Symmetry: D2
Subunit: 218 residues, 4 copies
């Protein structure tokens, strides 16, 4: 595919989730610059407010199209349109918490639509997630490669916690395009930095931003 994605795109998102039994719905309205690998979004909790867990666990669920890919690495994501692609992710936290997030991404006009599901279980009640002790995800480098023919990104993630300590989470995301004839990339990397730019007291309203750049390491 010869991508027709534009330098400026809009984003609409709906997330339905359940973490440690707490049900919630979050709506997102955003935009981004696909070729610059930058995007931002306004998130609003529509059901389940106020959330009783760390908002940070949800943020990476709020689209690799927004990553700056150099010409020498096939861009699986920008090639995946007009039909779109979906992804599945496991988030395994070091204290036993486990989450699964999925997103089905489609395109209508210049807007990407995202149908997101997020489920989390086994978080210790007095742990940093249920006690809202997280400050941010540190920047990261995602390792992209094919597993049984499916593009997969593995990441060593870490949440900085109050008290200046880290809490590790291992990510595995599988990406599946619905577009025919996509050229698959070889082993590569995608640097990321996700940030909550601002938020209200209970995180009912959050401004999120991500910068991502693909590269060949070394």
């Amino acid at each position: 595919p010869m991508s027709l994605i534009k330098p400026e795109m809009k984003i609409k998102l709906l997330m339905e989730g359940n973490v440690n039994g707490h049900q919630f719905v979050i709506e997102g309205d955003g935009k981004g610059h696909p070729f610059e690998g930058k995007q931002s979004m306004d998130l609003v909790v529509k059901e389940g407010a106020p959330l009783p867990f760390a908002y940070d666990i949800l943020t990476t669920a709020f689209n690799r199209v927004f990553a700056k890919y150099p010409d020498h690495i096939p861009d699986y994501f920008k090639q995946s349109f007009p039909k779109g692609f979906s992804w599945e992710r496991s988030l395994m936290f070091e204290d036993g918490g486990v989450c699964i997030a999925t997103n089905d991404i489609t395109l209508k006009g210049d807007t990407f639509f995202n149908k997101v599901r997020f489920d989390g279980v086994n978080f210790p009640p007095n742990g940093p997630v249920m006690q809202k002790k997280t400050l941010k995800w540190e920047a990261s480098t995602e390792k992209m490669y094919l597993r049984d023919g499916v593009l997969t990104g593995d990441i060593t993630m870490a949440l900085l916690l109050k008290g200046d300590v880290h809490y590790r989470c291992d990510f595995r995301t599988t990406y599946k395009s619905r577009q025919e004839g996509v050229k698959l990339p070889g082993y590569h990397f995608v640097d990321h930095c996700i940030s909550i730019l601002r938020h209200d007291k209970d995180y009912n309203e959050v401004k999120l931003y991500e910068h991502a750049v693909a590269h060949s390491g070394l």
Copy 2:
């Protein structure tokens, strides 16, 4: 609590799930002998038939009330009524597949009602689960203990596959009672044996059975 659960009880269940993008709904009608630790259930796929993955990954999601507890070990489950209890489980397969299952169990008359959710992601497309190469779960021994005050069961599970080889899965289930004043047990074990007694060609109809016995090891 002084349990009023009877020697014969009925079971009603509804599971909504999504594995590797495949959505499905399964209804269960069963019964069991709580004090003998035995139960059986008739399962029918109501939506999403025929399932494109190994039915076995779902079976343990289809109630520890059905486990023979000796008098010297507090029975967290039989004490959890009339209000009921819920559980959350992570299933981590050795080839990357990850599932989360949850069940909210309630009681009406002599019938346990089960609201079950099952989500699975990252299964390799040519793996034993997506290729339906499983034969059964082997019997197991669940290790029960408290983690940050929450009763937790960890298990070394294994699926026997065609070709006489095994496929490992690690289970962690957290159990949370809604009943006040429940007496918590110390570290103990629960032996299990779950079996599909019979099924039709595509597993649209399955007869399931479980035998479970709690003990103190040694």
Copy 3:
């Protein structure tokens, strides 16, 4: 093989180890009843005394011959003589500690000789292992099966700590016989209970005991 192992056997052992940089040597003199699955041993720290870490992490390194096997399950271990067998084990603790233990077991007369190596790394300095806060390993059930043709035992292990909490460790042991024509068992279980019967203040002298019984579950 038709085992000539006797109902009463002796044991000689030498362990060379290094945990978090601390080098040590421990000698063991013991005995056991192979067909009853019971054994005991006197252990003496010969170098590296006093150990600065929890002695309990070492104890399972101090022979599955000492397990009561029923007639219907092939006994890989009692069949492994006179040539002997060796085993390798990874111990993965939940806070990042990782140990590898190995033992080459031989037989001379009525005495099993054990050449043991134990290495442990990445234990947090203020963790329960380096701070000697363990009380005992809980009893366990080892799941025995073949992995790529090699007998393997996976176990959900747990150390009881001071303060009435548990610290999890996952075990994987691979067993390899040097005896020709050994009949391999199918999937089965081995219940264990290991205990330090008594010890001096710094654990320079320890009396250890293990009871183990193989079975088919259910």
Copy 4:
């Protein structure tokens, strides 16, 4: 400490190891440019030749001093002299193989001396490691942070195998300086690229090279 490490340094190394029961000794003679983050080494198998497993599993055991650190990130390694530092590492492969590597690094004149130990267990006999099917480690990005006060590096590593597929290994290295008053860095990254430049048929003689650069991501 105000580092006196020079732009050109020499390296002497001795590794004693045992993988899946195979004992070996390898000697290394090399050199590097600490401030450029580049080093190379000539490795010779002195005992245990020819190795029956993939040489690649050993290569990262053959010193973070050789990493280009920018001025804004404290360099734990170049500050660790003249007394030196040591490190411990767990290598957890996706098919069950587990290795532990350790290195005690000292300095005499302009030469770093390395006392290395490498132990590996539980590798499937027909797996890529025991069958020598690896081609190289892909480049990587190590995530550096403090865990219970100890500098730790976690990495998502991957070995490229014959047949154009990847084999994952998770690394955790803990670094411990013997030098007093070292300024600890905050969360950061170290990009790496390790390569076998050339080797003889059985890998008895190997020319190894590494390029590494520390950065703050984004």
